[PDB]
Amino acid sequence: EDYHKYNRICGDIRRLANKLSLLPPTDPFRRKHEQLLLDKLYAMGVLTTKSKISDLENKVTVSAICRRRLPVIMHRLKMAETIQDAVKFIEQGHVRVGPNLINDPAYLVTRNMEDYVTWVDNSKIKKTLLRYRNQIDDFDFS
Amino acid sequence: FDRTAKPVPVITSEVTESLEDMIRRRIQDSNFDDLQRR
Amino acid sequence: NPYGLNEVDDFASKREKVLLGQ
Amino acid sequence: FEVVEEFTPVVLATPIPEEVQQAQTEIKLFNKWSFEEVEVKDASLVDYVQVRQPIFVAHTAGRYANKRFRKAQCPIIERLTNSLMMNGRNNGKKLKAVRIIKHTLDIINVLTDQNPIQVVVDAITNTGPREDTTRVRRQAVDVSPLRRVNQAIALLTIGAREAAFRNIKTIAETLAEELINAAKGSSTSYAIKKKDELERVAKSNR
Amino acid sequence: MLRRQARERREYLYRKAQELQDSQLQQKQVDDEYAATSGIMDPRIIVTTSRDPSTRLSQFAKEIKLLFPNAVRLNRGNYVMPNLVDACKKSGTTDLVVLHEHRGVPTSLTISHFPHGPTAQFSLHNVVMRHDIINAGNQSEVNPHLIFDNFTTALGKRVVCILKHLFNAGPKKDSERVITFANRGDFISVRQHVYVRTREGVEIAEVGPRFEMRLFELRLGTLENKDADVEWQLRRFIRTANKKDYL
Amino acid sequence: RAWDLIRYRNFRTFTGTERIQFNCLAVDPSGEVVCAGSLDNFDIHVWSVQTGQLLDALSGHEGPVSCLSFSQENSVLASASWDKTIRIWSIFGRSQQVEPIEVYSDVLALSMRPDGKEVAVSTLKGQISIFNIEDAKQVGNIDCRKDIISGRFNQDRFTAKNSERSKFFTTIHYSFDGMAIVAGGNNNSICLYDVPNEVLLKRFI
Amino acid sequence: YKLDVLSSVHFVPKPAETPTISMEDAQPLYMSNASSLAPQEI
Amino acid sequence: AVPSVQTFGKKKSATAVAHVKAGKGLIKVNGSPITLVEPEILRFKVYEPLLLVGLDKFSNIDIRVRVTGGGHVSQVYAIRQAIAKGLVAYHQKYVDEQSKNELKKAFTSYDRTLLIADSRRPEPKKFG
Amino acid sequence: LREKAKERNPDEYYHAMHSSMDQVKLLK
Amino acid sequence: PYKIFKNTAFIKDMFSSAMEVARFEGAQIKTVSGIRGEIKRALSKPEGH
Amino acid sequence: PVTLAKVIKVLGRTGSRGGVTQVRVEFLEDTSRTIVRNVKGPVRENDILVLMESEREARRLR
Amino acid sequence: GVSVRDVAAQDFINAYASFLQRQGKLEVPGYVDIVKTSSGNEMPPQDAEGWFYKRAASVARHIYMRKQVGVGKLNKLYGGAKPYKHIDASGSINRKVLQALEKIGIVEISPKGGRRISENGQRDLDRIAAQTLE
RNA sequence: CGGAGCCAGCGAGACCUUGGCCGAGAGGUCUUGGAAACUCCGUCGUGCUGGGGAUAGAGCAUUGUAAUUAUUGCUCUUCAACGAGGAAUUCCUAGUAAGCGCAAGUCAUCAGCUUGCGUUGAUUACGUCCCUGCCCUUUGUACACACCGC
Ligand SMILES: [Mg+2]
Ligand SMILES: [Mg+2]
Ligand SMILES: [Mg+2]
Ligand SMILES: [Mg+2]
Ligand SMILES: [Mg+2]
C-alpha cells in the first residue's frame, strides 16, 4: 500500500502553514488564509474539531485522510463488514452519497455529506436488509 | 429529631426589605449582570 | 478499525467500555 | 359505436353484495343518495357550499383548518356532521353524528320525496343572513358568503338540538323537521326566525 | 437526519469532556452550548406545560411567557415528548420550558436548551402569581435589566449562564424593568420590579410573580433523553444535606 | 451578491453569520427580499435588498434545502429538500404560514408556474409531480425514468440498463405559456414534456 | 485543487516586458467610467 | 415462485401489512372477508379503493391484510392505504407500468392519503 | 443496550442476513 | 413497610394517627440495612400510615 | 329585489372597526358600476355578496 | 368452505342461539332467571327465556376463534367497566355454559387445560354458518 | 338499562399466575409455569321517570388481632340535594378545545395525587390596528435604480 499522494497532501499543508508562520503575525493577509485552511480541512473532515494552526501542523496525518475514504467510512457505519467488501460494493454501484452514485472507492466523503451515504434504492443488498427485518415495502420498490 | 433536607425558606418582611435594598443598590450603581451584543 | 478512530470515536468507545465494565 | 374494457364477467372469490357493485357504478352518500342533481340555487353561495365531489360517508379526515378558506372545499354534509357534535358530552364522537345524519336523511326522504341532500342545500341557502349589524347602537353591514354558510349551519344545528333537548322528539327527527322547514322557507324553523330577526334589526339601523 | 443527531451528540459529549479538563487545569467564559450564539441571535423560547393542565398552571404558563421577551406559549394536548422537542428543533426554538403543578400549585420548572442540552430542572416554592393581585394592570414588556446575586461556585456560574441566555442581549440603559435572581442558600428568589430614578436614590415597585426555584438536576441532553449523562444532581439523603450549599 | 446591470457594479453583498455555503437562490418579485439555501444548514436565510440585513431564517426543513422559487404573481416561496417534502411559505404579511407537502422521494429540482398557481418538482425516483399551491394537493405526475438516456461510463463494471447513476432530472423549468416543461440532469438527454397530458413532446441528445 | 479532486463527484480541471491585451473586461467597452458613478458619488 | 408483493399502510399507531399475490379475487382482512370489517358505518371507506378502480382488477389477485395497533378509525385508514399501495405495487411488478400510472392517477385524484401516509406532525404555528 | 438500539444504522448489512412424549422425542 | 415503589415506600406501625406523622414530617429515618430515608407525608387512610 | 356584486378589491388601511372589512364590489348586472361596501365576515376577492340596497355608499365605522 | 369467520358475528350468534333453543338439549341452570351475569350490572338479562342459549352460542364461537379457552378468559371477555374497577363477568354462568356445551359435544376438554372445539362441534358450527349465508 | 361485537401504546429490583371444581356475588379450594369511550340489535320513554346514588336498615364474606375491634367488597331494601347555575370572572387557534381509559411512582413535588402513554376528535379566527395595552422611529445613512426631503 502506497500513501505517496497523501504524504504530499500532508506535506503541502505543512509547507504552506510554515510560510504563514514566517509572515508577520499582525498581517491580515496571513490570518485570513490560515482560517480558510482550517475551515477547508474542517469541511473535508480531516480535522474533527476546529483547531489552531499549530495543532494543524501535527493533527494532519495520512491516517486522517484514509479515514475519510468512502470504503473506510462505510466500514465504520457498518454498511460493510470489511474494507475489501466495501470496495466491491462501491465498484458494483450499490452505494450513493447524496443523490449521486459513487463508483470510485478512492472518493473522500466530506463532513456534511457523511450523513447521507447509503445504499441505492433498488440495490439487491438493500432488499436483503429489509427482508431480514420483514420491512420490505414494494411501493418504494425496495 | 433531625431533618434530612434543608427547610423551604419563608419570605418574611425583613427578607423582602433586604432583597429590595440589594436591588435598589444595584440600580443606583447601574450594576446589572445582563447580556450584551458581541 | 483498520485505520483507527478519530478523537470523538475514541472517546465514545472508551465511555462504552467503562459502562460495560460496570 | 361501443367501447368495452371488460370481456369476462367479474366474479370474486370473496362475495361482494350487489349494492356494493351498484356503488361501483356511482358514488352515493351512504350508497343511497346521488350528488348529480344537487345544485345550489343561490349564485352567491356557490363556491362555498361544496357538493361536487361525491362521498360515500361523511368521515373524511381531511385537513381544512390549515388555511383560511379550506373549509369552503369541505363537503357540506361533513360540515353538518362536524357541527352536530358539541356541548362537551358529545365532543369527539363523530360516528354518532354520522349515524344521526343518516337517520335524518332517511326521515327527510320519507316525509318529502325530494332528494334529502337537495333539502339540506336549500335549507342552508335559505337560512343564511344576507345582512347583519355591528356595534358602533348598531350599524348595518353586509355578510360574506363564508360567514353565511357557517352561520346557517350553526343556526340549523343549534335549533335542532335545542328543540329536542328535553322533548320526546329525537335529534334525528327534529333535525329533519328543521331542515324541511328551512328549505320551505316557513317561519316554523328556528333558524329562519333568527335570520329574519337579524335582517330586520339591520334594516332598522340601515 | 437521525445519523446527524447521533453524530452531533458524540461531538457534544466530547466537547463538554474537553472543556471540563480545560476548566480543571486552569483551577490547578460563556459555555460551549451558548458560546456560538451569545450576543448575536436573540433567544427563541417555547413555554409549555404537562398534559391536561389546570387553569392555574395555564395562567402561570402565561406569566412565565410574559417574563421572557421572546417566549411563546404552546398548548400541550397529546403531544409526545420526542415529537415535542423534534418539532421545536425544526422551528429553530432555542429553549423549552415545561411547567408542572399539583392541584393548581406550580411545583416544578424544567428548562431544556437546544439542540443538545443542557436540561435544568427546578422546583418552585412560595409561588405567588400576578393573578393573585387585584387591579394589578398589565406588564411592561421591554427587554429587562438582569441582576444575578450571590452566584459564586462553578455550578452557580453554570446556572447563571443558563438563565442569562433566556433574555435578549443589549437592553436599553434607561429600561425601567429589572428581573432579579438572588441566591439565598441555594433557593433562588425571582422578583420583577419597575424602578423610577428619584433625585436622591431609586424607587422600585414589584410586579410579580414571586417564586423560589431550587435546582435539583442538570443533565447533558434534551429533556426527551432520560439516558442523558447527568452533569450534576442534588443529593438529599447525604448526612450533610440539611446544611450543604451548592450555588 | 446583487449586480446592477445598467452600470455593471456589485452594489451589495449578503452573507451569513457563520459563512454558510449557498447552493440555491430565489428573489422576491418586488426585488426587496432575497432568499438562499444551503446543503449544510437546513435553514433558508432571508435578507433585505435595500438594507442587506438578515431579516430571519426560515426553519422547518429536516434536510438540506435543494431548491427555492418565488411566485412571480402571488409572491409565495416554495422550497423543497432531501427531506422528501415541499413547504410553501407565506412570508409576506402580518402572519406567517407554512404548508408542508409530502413527496415519495427526495426533491432535486423545483419550478414555479408563471401564473403562480402550481409548482412542479423533479424527484430522485425520476418523477415530475405537479401540485396546486392554493389547495396543496397533487394535480398531475409524469414518469421520466424510461425516457432518460444514460450511457455506460468507460470505467463501469455494470451495464447501463442496470445502472442507476442518473435516471432523474436535476433541473426543470416551465414554458412561459405554462403547457410544457424542459428537464435535464447528469445524463445525455434533454426531455421536453407537456404538463396537461403528461407525455414526452421531444427528446434531445 | 488536490483536495477538490479527491472530494469532487464530477471532473475538476486543473487551474491555470510586452504590452498586454485584456481578454475580459468588467464593463462593456462602450460604457464609460463617468457613467458608472451615481450622482451622489459625484 | 408465485408472484407476490408486500406493502404497509399506517395511521397513528395502526399498521396494516397487505400481501397481494396472483389469485381469483379473494380479499381478506385479519383472516376474514373484507365485507365483515367493522365499524359498519365506515365500511365503505375500506371499499373506496376497490370501487374506484373497479373490481375487475382484483379478480386476478388475492389480498390478505393483517392489521395491528391503533383504534377502529385508524385501522380502517391503514387497511385502505395498504390495499391501494399493494394493488399499485403488484400492477407495477407483474403488470405493465401504464396500468400502474392509471391506478396512481385515480387514487391521487380521489384521495392522496390512499398512497402517501397522513402524519399530523406537530407544527409550532406561532413563529417563535 | 439502549443507546445501541437508539443509534442503530438501518443500512448496516451482514452476509449472515442472507441465511406419548417419549415417542415424539424418539421419532424426532 | 407494607407497600414499596422503588425509592418510595409506605410505612406502618410507627405512628397511631396522622396527627403524629405531621409532627415528624421531614424527619430523618433509616432501615436496619442502613438505607437512609425521610418521612414525606402522612397518608389519610389508614391512620398512622 | 336584491342585487349581487362581486368583490374586486379588499381595501386596506381604511380604519374600520375590528371584524369589519371595507371592500369594492362591481355589480354583476352591469360590470362597470362599482360601489364601496362594508362586510362582516371573512372576505376575499372574486366572491359574491348579496346587497339588499345598492344605493348607500359605505362610510368608515371607526 | 363456509366458516364462522365468513359470517357476521351477531348473525351467527343469533342463528345458533335459536338452534340450541330449538334443540332443547342444552342444560340450563335453574338460577338463570335470578342472576345478572356480572356484579357490575344492575338488572338481569331482559330476554329471560333465551339469554343463556345466546350466551352458549357466543361462548361457542369464541372457542372457535381461540383454540383453547378457560373460565377465567371468558370472565374477562364478558367483563366490563363499573374510580373504575373493570369487574369480570360471573364465573358460575360461564362454567355452566362450558359444561353444558360439552354435554352436547360442541366443545370438549382441551389439552393443558381449557376447552377445545370438538370435531363434531367443528362441523356443527360450520353447519349453521352455511345456514345463515343461505 | 340487557345482550352481542371489538380496536391501543407506555412501561418490569413469599408474591403472581394458565387451568379444574364450588358460590348469585364478594370470595373460597385443588393444581401448572414465572382498556374505556365506541358499534349493532332490543326495553323504556318527558313523568325528578327505568337520570342521580347521599343517608339509613338487614345479611354473606376478606384482612389483620385477640378484640365480639375496626377494615375492605358483595346482595336486597330505603331513595335525598341536584331541573344547566346571580353579580362577576379564567383560559383557549389543529391532531388544538373537549371526551375516554391504561400504566409507573425511577434522590425535588406528588399517593385516587403527579407524570407518562395511547384512543375519539371538532366550531370559530388565521384579518385589523378602530378600542385597550406594550413598544420603535422622527442625523435615509441605506452601495446601484426608484422613493423621500427640516
Ligand atoms: Mg384538555
Ligand atoms: Mg396533571
Ligand atoms: Mg390537575
Ligand atoms: Mg393573528
Ligand atoms: Mg361486553
- C-alpha G8 – ligand 4 centre gap (Å): 47
Chains B and I touch (3+ CB pairs under 8 A): no
Chains I and F touch (3+ CB pairs under 8 A): no
The CA distance from L97 to L70, in Å, is 11
Buried b (16+ CB within 10 A) or exposed e, F155-193: eeebeeeebbbbbbbbbbebeeeeebbbbbbbbebbbeb
- Whether chain D has a CB inside 8 Å of the CB on F96: the answer is no
- Tell the residue number behind the cell numbers 399551491, with chain if given: F133
Q: Is E231 helix (H, G, I), strand (E, B) or coil?
A: strand
Q: Which of residues 82-141 of D touch strand M (CB under 7 A)?
A: 82-83, 85-86, 88-89, 91-96, 99
Range of the domain at K58: 1-62
Interface residue of C6, C10, C13, C15 to substitute, partner E, most E CBs within 10 Å: C15
- Asked whether strand M has any atom less than 7 Å from the CB of E172, the reply is yes
- Assess contact for D178 and D186: CB atoms under 8 A: no
DSSP E strands: which ranges in chain F? 2-4, 9-12, 22-27, 33-38, 44-48, 54-58, 65-70, 77-81, 85-90, 97-102, 107-112, 118-123, 127-132, 137-143, 171-174, 180-184, 190-194, 199-204
- Grid coordinates representing F44? 433558508
Asked whether the beta carbons of residue E10 and residue C12 sit closer than 8 angstroms, the reply is yes
Judged by its nearest atom, the ligand closest to the C-alpha of residue E50 is 2
Q: What is the residue-wise DSSP string for H36-90? A: G-SSGGGHHHHHHHHHHH-TTGGGGEEEEEEEESS-HHHHHHHHHHHHHHHHHHH
- CATH hierarchy code of domain D7-206: 1.10.455.10
The CA distance from K26 to L14, in Å, is 67
Contacts with D141 (C-beta within 8 Å, 6 or more apart), sequence order: D131, D132, D133, D134, D202, K20, K37, K38, K39, K40, K61
| Structural determination approach | cryo-EM
- Assess contact for E119 and E110: CB atoms under 8 A: yes
For residue J9, the cross-strand partners are J4
- Whether chain H has a CB inside 8 Å of the CB on D90: the answer is no
Please state the separation of Cα D179 from the chain's center in Å. Answer: 9
Ordered by where they begin, the domains of chain H are: 1-127 (3.30.230.10)
- Whether chain A has a CB inside 8 Å of the CB on C9: the answer is yes
Amino acid at E147: I
The CA distance from F130 to F198, in Å, is 10
The closest of E191, H74, E101, H108 to F103, measured between CA atoms, is H108
Given A80, A119, A128, which is nearest I17 (Cβ)?
A128
Contacts with D153 (C-beta within 8 Å, 6 or more apart), sequence order: D79, D80, D83, D124
Chains H and L touch (3+ CB pairs under 8 A): yes
Inter-chain contacts counted by CB atoms under 8 A, chains H and L: 8
Buried b (16+ CB within 10 A) or exposed e, D3-24: eeeeeeebebebebeeebeebb
M32 nearest neighbour residue (CA to C1'): L112
- Assess contact for D54 and H110: CB atoms under 8 A: no
Structure resolution, Å: 3.0
Task: L104-112: list long-range contacts, CB under 8 Å, 24+ apart.
Answer: L104/L23, L104/L25, L104/L26, L106/L60, L106/L63, L107/L60, L107/L63, L110/L67, L110/L68, L110/L69, L112/L68
Contacts with E237 (C-beta within 8 Å, 6 or more apart), sequence order: B4, J36, J37, J38
- Asked whether strand M has any atom less than 7 Å from the CB of K1, the reply is no
- Grid coordinates representing D174? 327534529
H or E segment to which residue B16 belongs = helix B13-28
C-alpha dihedral sign at K7, K8, K9, K15: negative
Contacts with L120 (C-beta within 8 Å, 6 or more apart), sequence order: L105, L106
C-alpha dihedral sign at E66, E68, E72, E77: negative
Which residues, by Cβ under 5 Å, contact ligand 4, an ion? F 95
CATH at residue K49 = 2.40.50.140
The phi and psi torsions of F67 (rounded to 5 degrees) equal -170, 150
Give, in degrees to the nearest 5, the angle at Cα F194 between F190 and F200.
50
Given D44, D68, D203, which is nearest K4 (Cβ)?
D44
- Assess contact for F9 and G36: CB atoms under 8 A: yes
M4 nearest neighbour residue (CA to C1'): L10
- Assess contact for L125 and L116: CB atoms under 8 A: no
Task: H113-118: list long-range contacts, CB under 8 Å, 24+ apart.
Answer: H113/D61, H113/H77, H113/H81, H114/H48, H114/H49, H114/H80, H114/H81, H114/H84, H114/H85, H115/A139, H115/H81, H115/H84, H115/H85, H115/H88, H116/F102, H116/F104, H117/F102, H117/H9, H117/H10, H117/H11, H117/H81, H118/D61, H118/H11, H118/H77
- Asked whether strand M has any atom less than 7 Å from the CB of E110, the reply is no
Asked whether the beta carbons of residue C8 and residue E11 sit closer than 8 angstroms, the reply is yes
The CA distance from F77 to D116, in Å, is 44
Half-sphere exposure for H104 (CA within 13 Å, toward CB): 22
Amino acid at E97: V
Residue F110 burial by Cβ neighbours in a 10 Å radius (0-12, 13-18, 19+)? buried
The CA distance from H10 to H69, in Å, is 10
- Calculate the angstrom distance between C1' of M128 and CA of D145: 20
DSSP 8-state class, residue E174: T
Give the bases of strand M that a protein CB approaches within 7 Å.
1-9, 13, 17-28, 35-43, 45-46, 71-72, 74-76, 90-99, 101-102, 104-131, 133-136, 142-146
H or E segment to which residue K27 belongs = strand K21-27
